[PDB]
Assembly symmetry: C2
Homo-oligomer: 80 residues x 2
């Protein structure tokens, strides 16, 4: 679980356009992980581009951690 969270954050931070993981909430349900994450993104990204980054994060994270059964990713403005 601290393992799962570390893996989740690491995978999300490899996605281009992610500026950090701001919040992560994750729980086991049986052998399954349910998770909700907020990523930081460039304030000057369009909402569409931010949505594409979230979509990429969702795909990257689920691809790297097969136990995740459900993951929601949204984005908030964050400065480098």
């Amino acid at each position: 679980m601290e393992a799962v969270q570390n893996r989740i954050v690491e995978a999300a931070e490899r996605v281009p356009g992610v500026r950090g993981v701001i919040h992560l909430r994750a729980r086991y349900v049986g052998q399954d992980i349910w998770a909700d994450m907020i990523i930081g993104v460039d304030p000057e990204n369009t909402v569409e581009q931010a949505h594409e980054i979230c979509e990429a994060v969702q795909a990257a994270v689920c691809g790297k951690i097969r136990r995740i059964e459900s993951l929601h990713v949204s984005a908030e403005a964050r400065e480098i």
Copy 2:
């Protein structure tokens, strides 16, 4: 009272420029007061920081029109 309040939250939010409808609304009583979370639609081509300014404006408009609202979080998604 809760259904009348929900329709008033929706109408207050929908008069703020740049709001393209309310995608999701959740409202719960915590005390006598209402705590709420909403997702508004916005222009996909707005920047994230522009979207954030719209959400902040929806938060003020709704909380100024409904005194029983104690807490409201507003987040935006791309909509046509």
